[PDB]
């Protein structure tokens, strides 16, 4: 993560209590003032860091991180400055929602930078509650019963995500098969619009394992673009204005390499 607030993530390998070791992005010596590298790790004093629902989350929306405490009966965070100042522990006027499960945990639709959980699927909509790192009551709503129902967590050659194909900035619910894409308009509290299909995507249903897809916007517009793995090549699908999709770019992998279930693709601004 970018714990330091570089505007660039650092590689904070961490293994055990204390193993917090930030391989950090550094300018290369020589050349244009563009060349950058991950320098060596560093150790810094840190929380016991375990059994706690560990994560370097900014819970408050500062742009600057806390670390989550959620052990059995044990609940709050610390805050960490760019200096690495792990502030003293913070009980939180604590009233987080009961964690039944992570399954279908919402984030965005409370409003940008205000993220909060909702656990949800068909015919109902729990309400988010986060303000500024505290929470309201987690109220109940539903949209109108005609509205098509988005629901996370089936592997059958299919995916669901909170990710903005549309590029408004709202990481809309989108559902993907081997063959089609549908996306639900943001409607705020407890509500969604009838979904829009986005034309153009497909893949052979014989072989479309869902996880071979990758989610990023590439064009820089905001419209989330699409990538799919062949063992030799990437198929890259670019979002037409948030409406449909271009002919896929086919990209040859590094020579002799083959992509496989070990491989982890990502995109980043290293």
């Amino acid at each position: 993560i970018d714990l330091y607030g570089e505007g660039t993530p650092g590689i904070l390998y961490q293994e055990t209590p204390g193993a917090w070791w930030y391989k950090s992005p550094q300018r290369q010596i020589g050349g244009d003032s563009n060349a950058v590298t991950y320098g060596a790790m560093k150790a810094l004093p840190k929380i016991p860091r375990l059994q706690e629902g560990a994560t370097l989350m900014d819970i408050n929306g500062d742009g600057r991180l806390d670390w989550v405490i959620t052990s059995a009966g044990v609940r709050g965070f610390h805050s960490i400055h760019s200096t690495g100042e792990w502030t003293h522990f913070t009980p939180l006027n604590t009233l987080p929602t009961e964690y039944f499960h992570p399954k279908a945990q919402l984030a965005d639709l409370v409003g940008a930078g205000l993220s909060d959980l909702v656990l949800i699927g068909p015919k109902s909509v729990r309400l988010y509650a986060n303000q500024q790192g505290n929470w309201a009551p987690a109220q109940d709503v539903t949209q109108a019963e005609n509205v098509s129902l988005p629901v996370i967590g089936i592997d059958s050659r299919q995916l669901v995500a909170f990710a903005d194909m549309l590029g408004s900035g709202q990481q809309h619910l989108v559902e993907i098969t081997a063959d089609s894409v549908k996306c639900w308009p943001n409607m705020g509290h407890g509500r969604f619009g009838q979904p829009l299909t986005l034309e153009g995507f497909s893949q052979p249903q014989t072989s479309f394992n869902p996880d071979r897809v990758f989610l990023a916007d590439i064009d820089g517009s905001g419209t989330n673009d699409i990538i799919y793995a062949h063992s030799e090549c990437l198929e890259i699908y670019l979002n037409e204005s948030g409406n449909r999709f271009s002919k896929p770019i086919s990209l040859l992998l590094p020579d002799g390499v083959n992509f496989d279930n070990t491989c982890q693709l990502q995109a980043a601004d290293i």
């Binding site: 009966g73 709050g76 009980p91 604590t94 039944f100 009551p137 987690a138």
Partner: protein, 100 residues
């Protein structure tokens, strides 16, 4: 035929970090002709079941093991200081077994 094997409860709620919600449930009576087992005291509320470590096949009978399905119940909080406006609703969970 149907007989109750076990039960658990869940509360959509917000809880203080170290707040131990205090409440308990008890069975008044049960149908089918199916007290020490009839009462369970609860403080996690996430998926409470009144046992420090739940498991099947206890050499001793579980709180409502073998109870007739149709049955009546009483529920009440006990800590008075704890705020309750947080409460949305309660969801029960039941494991039961049946004949054919």
């Amino acid at each position: 035929q149907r007989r109750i094997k076990s039960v658990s409860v869940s509360l959509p709620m917000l809880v203080g970090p170290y707040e131990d919600v205090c409440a308990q449930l008890t069975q008044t009576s049960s149908s089918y002709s199916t007290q020490p087992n009839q009462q369970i005291s609860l403080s996690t509320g996430v998926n409470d079941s009144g046992l420090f470590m739940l498991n099947f096949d206890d050499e001793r009978f579980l709180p409502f093991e073998g109870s007739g399905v149709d049955s009546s119940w009483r529920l009440q909080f006990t800590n008075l200081k704890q705020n309750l406006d947080s409460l949305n609703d309660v969801i029960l969970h039941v494991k039961y077994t049946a004949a054919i």
